[PDB]
């Protein structure tokens, strides 16, 4: 019958590993870097585009920083479709928890949400997991700012800095060395864009190949402001840190 | 639905499926759970390849399942939330349907039962988990602890590991803990815990997370600074 | 079941209930305490058709419960509020509805505000200064009215609470067999034991 | 609008002795003021000596007895040919009853036989499955009729001795089956002079140690 | 629930020596409407059995198709279909009674009362009836609706009781059927002078008797009576 | 890969043959039934010693008069024994009376077949299953994951399985008394056993009409196993 | 019993020249008991204002309900919903309950960003668009402000003078009603500002 | 005509609970029965009170009892009071607005709780206390129970206070009467304390207690 | 070989395996006789013990108060399928008051077993079936095979050794078929049957199991010292 077809996507190794998570972490490793920095003040979250053409129509694109809410944004790396289909369904666990308790969902519980749907698939329904991992940048009146990583295992850790896709090793090792606690947004900015710079497997990094944004309590007085960057202003942003 | 059998008996009578499962136990950080006369103690491994981590929301390795039981385990990280939020509903079943709150044997035979199930069940695979349950029953001062695993199998312990380098710090326990006399205080049982992790750990430093607790749903989760007290004396005293 | 009634005063919320119950001919019991503690800061008070009234406050007590576990975290007032009210709302389009009607009480630990809401079984909420459930806001709520202040004490919300209680004791043709009066404040949960 | 009930009249008694039990019952069928038959049987034998009618609406009544049978039947299969008890059966008809609590079986059930200890055992049942066991019962359409003569005649209400005025009850002593017969016979030829419904027949069934015997009675058919 | 629409009235029956005897009028009824006069409502089953039905004929004619297939499903695989192992009245009836039942039990009825007239294997007589509440009953004499309250009283002076079986002789019992239907046309709003017959007997077998009519009727008196009380012409 | 109802070529089963193989691995459990009762008795096989013995509970009460022991993948008895003790308190309460031992037996037998692709595989554990009605007297019945129960005088199941038959065979006779049986249970346990048989590592249990089924407190089976000791020193 | 006038309340919509304004009153009850007197019955999702008269549970439901919708929305559309779009969305949602309504009467009041026009809509309990360029009314005193909007209105006011007709339009219709009052307020919607100004009114 | 009519009661005292029950059901005016078992022993240790719905009474507490055995089998310990009539209660919750009829209390006298009473209701109604009365005589019962009930009543004299309170609606209630059933539920089981024919109990205790002057014997 | 994994395979020969492996479950069972005469019509079964201490294991099946089986094989398939039987001699009493034909019962076997072998995910059963009945038609024997192969015989045997029994009952046929109204006669006839499959072992009290159907006899069957008479 069917038997003979299937491939068996949630099973274990003889030494206790999932098959198809570990492919899909092998998957994910070929993405384009995307690096998300806490600071005291607000949070970063950079990303590259994977080798773009002079005819993609950058101001209207997005395949790497979404929005979940006003508070929560994400920075994908893996199979853009996949992540789509995630970010509608976490969108819509937001506004449940809107409805249901007339409050901002705080980040941990969407994060934690999501994970679950993730580990799902490793462990019913026979079905191949999802190719994404997300670095989650969010704001609430509890921890206040906060980075979080998932990945297709459905495992997620909290963060100061951090690093997923290509080059994380190499990424990670920068984040590690220059990163202090007492750090600012501006100073985040300023080291992502050097980290992504030297991890880069292009030439040379320019506008065109990045995606940028900042969460800031720089909104006017006691509120939070997500700001996702235009061409323009990515073009600014890379002149203003010396980089071109 | 998918229903295929995953977890199936090979020739010589093992399912692999489960025993695969415990392998995924033995890569998980190590785990270790020690009851003295009026408290137990849970100890937990944080493998320190892992820095720039945010400590403060970063998934603690202890959960509480209810006010008075808590909940560790070595394995899977994700598969451990699906035990713990099961776990967590079922307390409150309980004490919504029979008015007391569950037993630390009861809550561990639940969990453990939920374990068996994805064992012979279509479609699924076992949980790569361990897990350590601890507390104190309702109105009593008997201190628990007890241990489950992905075939579904339960058991108490006076004291007790789990995870990697596990054989090791069982070794430890099995020489250095005397059942005529546990640990009569919470500072004697503490540092029996953190004893036993220095076995195995590496350094003293966020390596090792201690929590404890007491009768009547007291239960506190200890600071670095408080930790690492501990891991002073026990190696000031070995410099001898 | 009969009577309930609430005041939010300067530092606390005052829950009032009855202790009756009253199966039709007779008065089974008079010391019935009409409330559940949802969490340490939150209290709810309920009436309405028998059966459940209590099954209704303890469903959503459990819940409330596994929240606080799940989160290690206590839900505000007004989250609380809107969890029930969307019970309640839900409840209505049902086959067989909750005929229960709450005040819930609760002291916000973030806002330093004791808070007040009223909820019917519709899911009809309403956060107020002071609330009544059934024919109890028809005789208290004129007193009210003329009494109340935003900078009351406990003590004077307690004595403005006796006045409610003596109208409604002297022109309810009911015997609902005196009150449970409750406390909720930043030190959380007690019983005034002397009413 | 449809009326899934109907009541086919009838009146049927039970009467558990000392080593011996009872359970007759009128063989006239009816509805409204029509009858349907003279001789349609009530109470039937169900197997392990034990006897059942189910009085008030036939429909219903038939459908019970033949579950209660197939109930026996399949007793046996499940439990190595064991003999189903007086006792057990009882409460098995409460289920069968019970189970359509929402939509009843519309009759009044008796059964009849002997206990474990050997001794006469009468069990009845309202339509929802209540039960209790019973010395004496009356069921159905005469039921008013039979009953209180029963209290006077089987157990000795009222009486007291000669001589005393009051003071000293009438002594509970047990009755033959020949005597019993004779109550039953008086109980269903009093109720047929009053009752509309009772006649034409009389059907009784005897249990013993022995096993189950038959008794017929013509009964006036106005 | 529904309510009748087209309904046949009084089926009626009795038991003689050798076997059974079944009639019924050729009337479909739309409610005080004499619409449709050639209905036939004894439908034979095998050689051995007829089955009377009154009440909704939409539902009798539902029945019918029932009763034909009853006898196609028992010829599957039934190498003794015509002999030891053909259809008995007494498993036809006992089919109808748990349909009958378990419609009602739906609360969606078979709105019709039925009557099974047959002869066993052994040669015994097989009368029983049953209706849309699943009430069944057996007798020496049985009739439906009008039959009921008409027939049944003159049929039972003929047998009374079952030792009055034995003394009935076809001849005697065929007259009292056919005398029944003559009071019944005289009586029933809802009847007609056309009937059908049917014989069961286990020596000569199934005798089928249709387009009978009502004869040797009582008029004549009628001319006699002006008036309804002092008029005299 | 092939299927999980799959035949062999010589008319078996390969995953019920294949869950034999589990049951072999198993600790051992004996059960031995005599006119005065029967007895039942357990290997507990503690993995560490700072396993708390008293907390392996190998052997379980199904209702007062039907007791239990088990052999092999223990946690899958679990769900055999909720299933066993409802088929008993579910005729309880259908016909005001106890259940036959036999016919309790026979239901939970009717789950060991219910596995394909219902559970995903047959149970890993055999059972022991004693008990007393009053139409067929004391009896013991051997329960496997085929879903055959056979009924025995006595019996051995788990790792020491055919060595203790083979002693039992010898032993067994239709007079054996209940203290008997006991300390034959005892006898044989201890022979079988990897480790030295003591009131921790092993477990007493017996089904008496009058007292129904009880688990023995390590306190009793301590002087049983000194009386062991006592008469086998005597010759 | 009838659900529609068991709280009580009222809203009103009127256009103006590059302006539009939206009105309620204040009052929640139960029948003859006043409950509360700080029940709003405007909500607003970015520019786009919804008055809902009605069952207040159904009220608060629906303004939940359009906050999720509308929220969902934007950030799929990477903009904010106009007033034409978000007519359709509550057509719809309320249709989808046709044979269980939410027993409501809501109303919906804005002006296009893009083009700059004013826009009013008024619907039924189960969808039916009401778009009328001068007025819409909606709630319990419904036939009083048919009467004071038919003869008040006039067509391009300027937005400090349609406060004026829209209020007087409000408080007479609201005293003619047992089950309307207890407060008021007026938002007027200009196309980057919107002033909300509660009036002054009987309190029985 | 389903039979209708009571009188049963259950009080807690320093020696544990009483619990009294009449004896008579009636279908409309006339007695089915004088001879019927409102006391359900639902176990050893456990009883309930029979008023409303016979069978639902019957069916649903021998159930009860079903589902109490089966938490000793799983938790190898005593189910409270509080988790029995609680199982009870939910189950009828369930069935609330399909027509079940029941006004029972659930009596229990265990180590955690000592005696208990719940008083349990088809409407969902689950309420603790002291002394209950339910059924179509409980108003005559409260009378006798509230006027010489107290906590120091011995087990000799409160037996009599249960007896003479059903009495006392036997009496006065058309639909109460038959016999009276006692019971003396302790920490080890309850006791019975037999079946006390109305008839003879009136004339018997009209004489000794000098009661019931009104009455001519 | 390639073609043994499943039951919905045919082999290049047009075999299905897992059938003929299924088939094979029979013959390892221990031996079962079938006769019938005119009026009556037995079965005998050796029935087979695990060791000394056990219990011998049933063999023989009632279905109805004029029907029943003994199985040979797996014994759990064998009651899934009396338990069928069972059900529907059932519902034939119930819905048509009727008897169910021995006949009727032996076609309703072979399509329940048949659907187990065209499907995928299922397996055959696991058993065969000796299923004597008296009914309106005479006495009755048939022999099931899960297969689904049912055939209507004089006599017959199954499992271990039976091709001895087999041959006895072919020399016997014209004997034993004339036994009429003698029901000791016939089941000396079939005791001696199932005695030429006997090797080492010989019929003992508890060993031996007879049932018996017949004109004025209800199904019943015979253990223990109620079988001694035979030996
Ligand atoms: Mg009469
Ligand atoms: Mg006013």
């Known amino acids: 019958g069917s038997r003979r077809y299937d491939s068996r996507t949630t099973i274990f190794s003889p030494e206790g590993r999932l098959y198809q998570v570990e492919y899909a972490l092998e998957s994910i490793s070929h993405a384009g870097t995307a690096i998300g920095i806490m600071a005291s003040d607000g949070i970063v979250l950079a990303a590259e585009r994977k080798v773009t053409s002079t005819l993609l129509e950058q101001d209207t694109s997005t395949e790497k920083l979404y929005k979940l809410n006003d508070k929560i944004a994400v920075a994908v790396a893996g199979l853009t479709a996949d992540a789509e289909i995630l970010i509608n369904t976490a969108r819509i666990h937001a506004q449940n928890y809107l409805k249901t308790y007339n409050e901002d969902i705080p980040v941990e519980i969407l994060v934690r949400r999501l994970s679950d749907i993730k580990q799902g698939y490793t462990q019913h329904g026979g079905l191949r997991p999802f190719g994404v991992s997300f670095i989650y940048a969010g704001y609430d009146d509890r921890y206040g700012y906060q980075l979080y990583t998932s990945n297709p295992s459905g495992n997620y850790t909290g963060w100061k800095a951090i690093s997923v896709g290509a080059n994380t090793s190499a990424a990670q090792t920068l984040l590690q060395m220059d990163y202090k606690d007492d750090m600012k947004v501006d100073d985040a900015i300023e080291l992502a864009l050097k980290t992504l710079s030297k991890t880069t497997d292009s030439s040379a990094l320019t506008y065109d190949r990045l995606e940028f944004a900042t969460i800031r309590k720089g909104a006017n007085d006691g509120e939070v402001y997500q700001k996702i960057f235009k061409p323009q202003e990515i073009k600014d942003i890379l002149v203003k840190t010396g980089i071109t | 639905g998918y229903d295929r059998a995953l977890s199936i008996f090979s020739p010589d009578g093992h399912i692999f499926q489960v025993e695969y499962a415990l392998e995924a136990v033995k890569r998980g950080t190590c785990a270790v759970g020690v009851k003295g006369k009026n408290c137990v103690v849970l100890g937990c491994e944080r493998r320190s390849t892992l820095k720039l981590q945010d400590t403060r929301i970063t998934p603690s390795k202890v959960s509480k399942i209810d006010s008075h039981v808590v909940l560790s385990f070595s394995g899977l990280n994700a598969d451990s939330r699906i035990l713990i939020e099961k776990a967590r509903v079922e307390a409150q079943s309980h004490r919504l349907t029979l008015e007391d709150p569950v037993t630390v044997e009861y809550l561990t035979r639940y969990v453990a039962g939920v374990q068996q199930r994805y064992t012979q069940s279509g479609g699924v695979r076992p949980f790569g988990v361990s897990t350590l349950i601890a507390g104190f029953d309702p109105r009593d001062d008997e201190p628990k602890l007890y241990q489950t695993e992905p075939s579904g199998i339960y058991s108490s312990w006076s004291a007790q590991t789990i995870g990697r380098n596990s054989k090791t710090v069982r070794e430890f326990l099995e020489k250095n803990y005397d059942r005529k006399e546990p640990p009569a205080t919470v500072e004697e049982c503490v540092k029996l815990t953190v004893r036993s992790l220095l076995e195995v750990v590496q350094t003293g430093a966020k390596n090792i997370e201690i929590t404890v607790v007491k009768p009547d749903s007291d239960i506190v989760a200890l600071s670095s600074e408080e930790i690492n007290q501990y891991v002073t004396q026990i190696e000031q005293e070995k410099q001898e | 079941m009969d009577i309930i009634l609430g005041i939010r005063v300067q530092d606390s919320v005052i829950l009032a209930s009855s202790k009756a119950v009253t199966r039709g001919i007779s008065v089974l019991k008079d010391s019935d305490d009409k409330t559940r503690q949802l969490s340490p800061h939150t209290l709810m008070s309920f009436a309405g058709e028998a059966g459940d009234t209590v099954q209704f406050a303890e469903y959503i007590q459990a819940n409330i419960q596994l929240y606080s576990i799940r989160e290690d975290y206590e839900l505000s007032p007004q989250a609380v509020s809107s969890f029930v009210r969307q019970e309640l709302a839900k409840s209505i389009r049902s086959r067989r509805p909750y005929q229960v009607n709450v005040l819930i009480g609760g002291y916000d630990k973030k806002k330093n505000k004791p808070e007040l809401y009223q909820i019917d079984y519709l899911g009809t909420k309403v956060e107020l200064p002071y609330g009544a459930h059934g024919y109890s806001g028809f005789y208290t709520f004129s007193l009210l009215d003329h009494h109340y202040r935003p900078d009351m004490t406990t003590e004077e919300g307690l004595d403005l609470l006796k006045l409610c209680v003596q109208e409604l004791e002297k022109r309810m043709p009911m015997d609902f067999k005196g009150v449970i009066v409750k406390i909720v404040d930043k030190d959380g949960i007690r019983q005034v034991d002397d009413f | ?222 | 629930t529904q309510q009748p629409i087209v309904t046949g009235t009084s089926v009626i029956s009795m038991k003689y020596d050798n076997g059974v005897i079944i009639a019924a009028d050729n009337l479909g009824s739309y409610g005080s409407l004499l619409r449709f006069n050639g209905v036939e409502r004894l439908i034979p089953v095998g050689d051995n059995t007829v089955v009377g039905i009154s009440g909704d004929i939409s539902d009798m004619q539902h029945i019918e198709r029932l009763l034909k297939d009853l006898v196609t499903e028992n010829a599957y695989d039934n190498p003794l279909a015509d002999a030891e192992e053909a259809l008995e009245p007494s498993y036809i009836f006992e089919y109808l009674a748990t349909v009958m039942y378990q419609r009602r039990s739906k609360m969606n009825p078979l709105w019709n009362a039925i009557i099974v007239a047959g002869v066993q294997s052994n040669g015994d007589q097989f009368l029983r009836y049953v209706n849309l509440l699943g009430v069944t009953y057996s007798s020496p004499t049985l009739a439906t609706g009008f039959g009921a309250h008409m027939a049944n009283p003159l049929l039972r002076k003929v047998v009374d009781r079952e030792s009055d079986i034995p003394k009935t002789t076809v001849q005697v019992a065929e007259e009292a059927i056919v005398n029944a239907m003559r009071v019944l046309y005289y009586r029933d709003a809802r009847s007609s002078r056309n009937f059908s017959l049917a014989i069961i007997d286990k020596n000569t077998g199934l005798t089928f008797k249709k387009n009978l009519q009502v004869e040797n009727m009582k008029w004549d008196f009628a001319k006699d009576i002006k008036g309804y009380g002092t008029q005299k012409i | 890969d092939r299927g999980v109802s799959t035949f062999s070529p010589e008319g078996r089963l390969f995953q019920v043959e294949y869950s034999l193989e589990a049951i072999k691995l198993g600790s051992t459990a004996i059960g031995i039934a005599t006119k005065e009762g029967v007895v039942l008795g357990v290997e507990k096989r503690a993995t560490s010693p700072l396993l708390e013995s008293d907390s392996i509970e190998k052997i379980v009460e199904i209702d007062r008069h039907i007791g239990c022991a088990m052999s092999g993948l223990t946690a899958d008895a679990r769900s055999m024994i909720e299933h066993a003790r409802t088929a008993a308190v579910t005729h309880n309460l259908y016909y005001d009376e106890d259940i036959n031992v036999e016919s309790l037996t026979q239901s939970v037998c009717d789950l060991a077949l219910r596995f394909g692709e219902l559970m995903s595989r047959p149970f890993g554990v055999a059972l022991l299953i004693a008990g007393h009605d009053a139409d067929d007297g004391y009896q013991l019945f051997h329960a496997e994951p085929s879903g055959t129960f056979y009924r025995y005088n006595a019996k051995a199941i788990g790792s020491g399985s055919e060595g203790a038959q083979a002693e039992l065979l010898n032993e067994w006779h239709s007079s054996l008394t209940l203290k008997e049986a006991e300390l034959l249970v005892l006898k044989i346990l201890k022979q079988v056993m990897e480790e030295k048989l003591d009131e921790n590592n092993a477990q007493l249990s017996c089904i008496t009409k009058q007292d129904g089924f009880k688990i023995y407190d390590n306190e009793k089976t301590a002087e049983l196993i000194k009386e062991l000791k006592e008469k086998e020193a005597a010759e | 019993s009838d659900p529609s006038s068991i709280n009580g309340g009222i809203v009103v919509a009127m256009t103006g020249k590059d302006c539009v304004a939206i009105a309620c009153d204040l009052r929640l009850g139960s029948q003859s008991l006043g409950v509360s007197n700080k029940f709003e019955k405007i909500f607003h999702y970015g520019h786009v204002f919804l008055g809902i008269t009605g069952l207040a549970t159904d009220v608060t439901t629906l303004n939940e309900m359009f906050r999720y919708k509308t929220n969902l929305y934007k950030l799929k559309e990477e903009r904010a919903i106009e007033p034409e779009t978000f007519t359709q969305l509550v057509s719809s949602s309320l249709y989808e309950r046709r044979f269980g309504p939410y027993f409501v009467g809501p109303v919906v009041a804005g002006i296009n960003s893009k083009s700059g026009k004013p826009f009013i809509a008024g619907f039924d309990l189960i969808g039916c668009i009401d778009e009328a360029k001068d007025f819409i009314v909606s709630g319990t005193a419904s036939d009083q402000l048919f009467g004071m909007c038919e003869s008040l209105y006039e067509p391009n006011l300027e937005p400090e003078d349609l406060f004026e007709t829209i209020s007087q339009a409000l408080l007479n219709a609201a005293d003619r009603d047992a089950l309307s009052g207890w407060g008021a307020v007026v938002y007027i919607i200009k196309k980057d500002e919107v002033v909300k100004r509660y009036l002054k009114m009987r309190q029985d | 005509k389903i039979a209708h009519g009571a009188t049963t009661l259950a009080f807690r005292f320093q020696g544990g609970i009483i619990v009294a029950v009449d004896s008579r059901a009636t279908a409309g005016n006339w007695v089915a029965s004088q001879t019927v078992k409102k006391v359900i022993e639902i176990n050893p240790f456990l009883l309930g009170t029979m008023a409303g719905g016979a069978a639902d009474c019957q069916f649903w507490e021998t159930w009860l009892g079903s589902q109490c055995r089966l938490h000793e089998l799983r938790e190898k310990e005593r189910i409270s009071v509080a988790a029995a009539s609680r199982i009870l209660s939910n189950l009828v919750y369930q069935y609330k607005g399909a027509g079940l009829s029941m006004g029972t209390m659930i009596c229990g006298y265990t180590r955690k709780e000592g005696p208990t009473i719940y008083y349990v209701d088809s409407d969902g109604t689950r309420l603790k206390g002291d002394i209950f009365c339910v059924g179509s005589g409980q108003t005559f019962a409260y009378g006798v129970l509230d006027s010489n009930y107290k906590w120091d009543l011995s087990v000799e004299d409160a037996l009599y206070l249960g007896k003479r309170s059903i009495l006392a609606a036997a009496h006065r209630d058309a639909y109460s009467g038959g016999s009276v059933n006692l019971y003396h539920v302790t920490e080890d089981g309850w006791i019975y304390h037999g079946n006390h024919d109305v008839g003879e109990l009136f004339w018997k205790v009209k004489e000794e207690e000098g009661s019931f002057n009104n009455v001519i014997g | 070989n390639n073609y043994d994994g499943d039951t919905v395979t045919f082999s290049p020969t047009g075999r299905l395996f897992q059938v003929e492996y299924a088939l094979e479950a029979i013959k390892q069972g221990s031996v079962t006789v079938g006769l019938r005469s005119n009026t009556h019509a037995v079965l005998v079964a050796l029935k087979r013990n695990a060791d000394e201490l056990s219990s011998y294991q049933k063999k023989i099946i009632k279905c109805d108060e004029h029907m029943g089986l003994s199985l040979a094989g797996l014994a759990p398939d064998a009651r899934v399928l009396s338990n069928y039987l069972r059900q529907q001699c059932n519902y034939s009493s119930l819905v048509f008051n009727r008897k169910l034909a021995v006949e009727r019962a032996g076609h309703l076997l072979c399509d329940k077993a048949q659907k187990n072998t065209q499907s995928y995910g299922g397996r055959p059963y696991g058993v065969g079936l000796l299923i004597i009945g008296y009914d309106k038609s005479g006495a009755h024997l048939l022999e099931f095979q899960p297969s689904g192969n049912v055939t209507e015989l004089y006599g017959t045997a199954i499992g271990a050794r039976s091709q001895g029994a087999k041959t006895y009952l072919e020399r016997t046929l014209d004997t034993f078929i004339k036994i009429d109204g003698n029901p000791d006669e016939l089941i000396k006839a079939g005791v001696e049957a199932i005695s030429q499959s006997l090797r080492d072992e010989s019929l003992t009290v508890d060993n031996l199991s007879i049932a018996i159907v017949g004109k004025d006899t209800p199904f019943t069957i015979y253990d223990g010292e109620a079988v001694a008479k035979y030996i």
């Open chain 4, 1 to 222: 609008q449809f009326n899934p009930y109907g009541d086919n009249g009838g009146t049927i008694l039970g009467i558990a002795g000392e080593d011996f039990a009872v359970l007759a019952g009128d063989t006239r069928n009816i509805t409204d003021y029509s009858i349907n038959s003279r001789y349609e049987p009530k109470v039937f034998d169900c197997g392990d000596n034990i006897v059942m009618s189910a009085n008030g609406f036939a429909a219903d009544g038939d459908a019970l007895v033949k579950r209660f049978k197939n109930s026996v039947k399949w007793y046996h299969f499940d439990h190595n040919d064991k003999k189903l008890s007086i006792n057990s059966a009882a409460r098995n008809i409460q289920h069968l009853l019970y189970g359509k609590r929402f939509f009843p079986y519309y009759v009044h059930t008796i059964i009849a036989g002997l206990d474990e200890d050997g001794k006469g055992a009468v069990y009845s049942f309202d339509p929802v499955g209540s039960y209790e066991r019973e010395q004496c019962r009356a069921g159905g359409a005469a039921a008013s009729l039979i009953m209180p003569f029963l209290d006077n005649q089987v157990n000795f209400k009222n009486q007291y001795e000669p001589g005393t005025n009051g003071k000293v009850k009438k002594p509970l002593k047990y009755l033959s089956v020949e005597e019993v017969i004779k109550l039953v016979r008086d109980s269903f030829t009093s109720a047929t002079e009053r009752h509309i419904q009772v006649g034409d027949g009389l059907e009784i069934l005897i249990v013993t140690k022995d096993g189950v015997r038959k008794e017929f009675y013509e009964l006036k058919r106005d």
